[PDB]
Structure 1
Amino acid sequence: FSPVPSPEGTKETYWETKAPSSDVLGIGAGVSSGNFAAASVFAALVGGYCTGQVIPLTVEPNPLFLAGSFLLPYSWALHVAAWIQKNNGK
């Protein structure tokens, strides 16, 4: 009804192709599909290992294993980015 503002750097992200344009990856638009795929497995293995090491949680947990455990959900976003880049030829 009046112009709706968006932050500067807003671009069009609507896609009807096989994969979205690499612009949907933000700062990771130039990373290769191999680099996400290897990061995806690495984050999954390290994240699972760190998660596994603190499953009985104590009042003194290792803070690196807590921080390293956040790599497991982060790996999910990594393989999605790996699939997007592979299907954009990157």
Structure 2
Amino acid sequence: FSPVPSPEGTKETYWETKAPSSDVLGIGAGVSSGNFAAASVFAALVGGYCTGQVIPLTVEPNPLFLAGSFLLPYSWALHVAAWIQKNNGK
């Protein structure tokens, strides 16, 4: 009804192709599909290892293993970005 504002740098992201344009990756638009795939596996293994090392949680958990455990969900987003980049030819 009036112009709806968006932050500067807003671009069009609507896609009907096989994979979205690399712009949907934000700052990761230039990273290669191999680099996301290797980061995906690396984050999955390190995150799973760190998660496993603190499954019986104590009052003294290792903070590096807590922080490293956040790599498991981050790896999901990494392999999605790897599929997007492989299907954009990157």
Into which bin does the TM-score normalised by the smaller protein fall?
over 0.9
Query: Matched residues in 2 for 1:57 and 1:64: separation?
Result: 14
After superposition, the CA RMSD in angstroms is: 0.1
Query: Matched residues in 2 for 1:63 and 1:89: separation?
Result: 39
Query: Matched residues in 1 for 2:57 and 2:45: separation?
Result: 20
Q: CA deviation at 1:65?
A: 0.1
Q: How many correspondences in the alignment?
A: 90
| Structure 2 residue runs without a partner (length 5+) | none
Q: CA deviation at 1:8?
A: 0.1
Once the two structures are superposed, what CA deviation does each residue of 1:50-90 show, in whole Å capped at 9, x if it has no partner? Answer: 00000000000000000000000000000000000000000
Percent identity for Structure 1 against Structure 2: 100
| Structure 1 residue runs without a partner (length 5+) | none
Query: Matched residues in 2 for 1:47 and 1:10: separation?
Result: 33
Show the counterpart of 1:68.
68
Once the two structures are superposed, what CA deviation does each residue of 1:6-43 show, in whole Å capped at 9, x if it has no partner? Answer: 00000000000000000000000000000000000000
The structure 1 segments of at least 4 consecutive aligned residues displaced by more than 4 Å after TM superposition are none
- TM-score scaled to structure 2, two decimals? 1.00
Query: Matched residues in 2 for 1:86 and 1:10: separation?
Result: 24
- TM-score scaled to structure 1, two decimals? 1.00
